[PDB]
Design a protein around this ligand. Structure first.
Ligand SMILES: Cc1c(C(=O)C(N)=O)c2c(OCC(=O)O)cccc2n1Cc1ccccc1-c1ccccc1
Ligand SMILES: [Ca+2]
Ligand SMILES: [Cl-]
Ligand SMILES: [Cl-]
Length: 123
């Protein structure tokens, strides 16, 4: 249930959400081994963020939230704390994506999972 997160990605990066699915070793469902670059670390951190929310009793993969973007930044909202927490994880990730746009490399979109090697860093 991630059309809102995709919308946030596009608003913050100028790229389609498609460009962040399968990116490196962590962007897209699950993920393992060592992140390829800073954008991939964003996704590793986002996965960690969701894990924390699942241990709080939230379902961040499913939560529907509200948000806006002014010049003052990203404003998160929602009826429940779990929806607002989900928005906060997404926000940190979208901001992280924007921040590392300088090292975004297209060779890592749709990265073959066999090329993911090394240890898996902890959260
Ligand atoms: C960037 C990203 C994700 C991450 O931020 C991440 N850390 O793995 C992500 C994702 O991560 C959450 C998780 O695995 O806990 C699950 C599914 C798609 C994901 N995507 C791609 C994505 C995001 C929003 C809307 C659509 C898509 C998407 C685009 C094309 C095909 C499939 C999904
Ligand atoms: Ca992931
Ligand atoms: Cl985080
Ligand atoms: Cl609701």
């Amino acid at each position: 249930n991630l059309v809102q997160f995709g919308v946030m990605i596009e608003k913050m990066t100028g790229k389609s959400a498609l460009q962040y699915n399968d990116y490196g070793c962590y962007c897209g469902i699950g993920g393992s081994h060592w992140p390829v670059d800073q954008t991939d670390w964003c996704c590793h951190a986002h996965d960690c963020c969701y894990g924390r929310l699942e241990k709080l009793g939230c379902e961040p993969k499913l939560e529907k939230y509200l948000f806006s973007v002014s010049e003052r930044g990203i404003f998160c909202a929602g009826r429940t704390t779990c929806q607002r927490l989900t928005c906060e994880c997404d926000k940190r990730a979208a901001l992280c994506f924007r921040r590392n746009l300088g090292t975004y490399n297209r060779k890592y979109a749709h990265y073959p999972n066999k090329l993911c090697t090394g240890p898996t860093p902890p959260c």
